[PDB]
Each structure stands twice: as structure tokens, then as C-alpha cells.
Amino acid sequence: QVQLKESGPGLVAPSQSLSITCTVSGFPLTAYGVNWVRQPPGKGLEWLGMIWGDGNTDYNSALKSRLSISKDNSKSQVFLKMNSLQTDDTARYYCARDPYGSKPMDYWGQGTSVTVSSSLV
Template sequence: EHFLGVMDLIHGNMKHLWVFLFVVAAPRGILSQVQLKESGPGVVKPSQTLSLTCSVSGVSLSSYGAGWVRQAPGKGLEWVGAIAGSGSTYYNPALKSRLSITRDTSKSQVYLQLTSVNPEDTAMYYCAGGTVRGSQCEP
């Protein structure tokens, strides 16, 4: 039996709904073998650049969307951005000028770079993957 946890993340006032499907338990099918692992520095000083890597196994990034969410201390989850299987990128408008999400399909890795970090960027950052549905996050 398949159990999918659905997280609905609405960003800004653009009324776009992003649905990230996280596999909690799925004995059968390709999603049951998908694993994501974040890596990067534990601490980044103000004005520096935050660089994170998400290593994906069990599926090709050419057909799998991946992105990032973050959670500041005492606050809820905030959608950061994502890159679709097609390679199209979608960014939180509030972070767009400082944010870059790229990937290397040959290494099965997705990268986040957030420049000029400030205290408001203090958070736990999580790699999220699966099916991303919604309109393009552009005006």
C-alpha cells in the first residue's frame, strides 16, 4: 500500500499552489527507491553565499523535479525554489534576486546558491523532490 504525504506550499500572494509529494512508504514502484540527501556548510556568516547540494538517487533528474524549502526557528515551512525535470527553474519571488538553483544530471545533484545571506535567512534547509504541480512562478 502506498502512503503519500502531501505538503501544500502557497508562496507570496501569487496564488500558485505547489504540491510536493513525499513518499512515506511505498513498497512498489520507482518512487519507493528515491532518496535525497542534503549536504553543505553548517554555518554561513552574513553577506556570504550559502551553497547546498542535494544528491538524488533512484530516479533520473531529467524526469524528476527537485527543490528546496526552509524552516526558520519557530516558523512554518517556506518554499524557496525548484527545478523541474525539464530544467525550468521556479523561485520564491522574495529570494529571486539572490537565488540560483541548478543541477548536474550526470551527477544526479541539485544545487542551491543564496548570495548575500542575512539573519532572516537563518533556517533549516531541506531538499524536496517529487511531483511539482502549479503555474510558473513569474509575473
């Protein structure tokens, strides 16, 4: 009965900041961890960061400089925020549940396609 849903922009101008909201259901954010994993077109999974039940954060050392993970347990939401985006940041961003101490990332969101471009209309 576990659900995770990412809400993101689709299109971001380069140098701007990306903000995604993972809204979880079917479990408490106070007992479970939530991860951010991205996937560039035709490339592999890249672990971005994680936020433990107790609010503690862990970031990918390569991207730590530009990443921010926060949450609102009462609203059952987790928030990713990434600064000064480039074209290599174009990827599908997934949030997944971490039942830390028992299993690795089990339930995943369907994703959010994020494109960094020369946008229009």
C-alpha cells in the same frame, strides 16, 4: 528506494553566499522536479524554488533576486546558491522530489541546519 541528501556548511558569515548540494538516488533528475524549502527555528515551511526535469527554474518572488538553482543530471545532483545572507536566513534547508503532473513534493531530505552568526575557533 528514493533518497535525497543535502550537504551544506552549518555555519555561514553574514553577507556571504550559501551553497547546498542535494544528491538524489532512486530516480532520474530528468523526469522529476526538485524543490528547496527552508524552515526557520520554530517557524513554518517557506518554498524557495524548483527545477523541472527539462532544467527550467521557478523562484520565490520575494527571494528571486538572491537565489540560483542548477543541476547535474549525470551526477544526480541539484545545487542551491543564496547570496548576501542575513540572520533571518538562519533555517533548516530541505530539498524534496516533485513528481510534477502526478503528486506534490513526496520524498524529502532530512535537512541541513544553516546558521548565520558571529562565529569562532
